[PDB]
Amino acid sequence: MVELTPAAIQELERLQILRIQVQPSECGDWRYDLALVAEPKPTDLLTQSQGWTIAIAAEAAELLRGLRVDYIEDLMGGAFRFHNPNASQTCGCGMAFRVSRS
């Protein structure tokens, strides 16, 4: 359902399982919300991929099926990056999107 680039994984050792959900946002409609968690909500959609579990929130499946997550330090600094095939628009930074109206 969802992938992470090896690059993201390792920024994820950074622990000084991952849970992707969305929240309403000013730029766009939805901004990704990322947490490191002890346990997936029981109804999350899980994927293995480089021995990590990825917890997609079920209500957001529609908004996230197919998602790609990468870490890049570029000229704006270091941040997770997102290639969401469901995004019909992403803000400038990539962390906010909107999908097409139903």
Q: Binding to ligand FES (CB under 6 A): which residues in 14-43?
A: 27, 31
Q: Examine residue 17 and tell whether it contacts Na ion (CB under 5 A).
A: no
Nearer to ligand FES by C-beta: 14 or 39?
14
Query: Residues 16 to 55: which contact a copy of itself by CB under 8 A?
Result: 16-44, 47, 49-50, 52-55
Instruction: Give the burial string for 39-71 (b: 16+ CB within 10 Å, else e).
Output: ebeeebbebeeeeeebbbbeebeebbeebebbb
Nearer to ligand FES by C-beta: 1 or 79?
79
> From CA 95, how far away is CA 84, in angstroms rounded?
10
The answer on whether 91 is annotated among ligand-binding residues is: yes
Map residue 11 onto helix, strand or coil. Answer: helix
> From CA 90, how far away is CA 69, in angstroms rounded?
14
How near is the Cβ of 17 to a copy of itself at its closest, in Å?
Answer: 4
Total residues contacting Na ion (rule CB under 5 A)?
3
CA angle 19, 31, 24 (to 5 degrees): 105
User: Binding residues for Na ion, per CB under 5 A?
Assistant: 25-27
Contact footprint for ligand FES (CB under 6 A)? 27, 31, 91-96
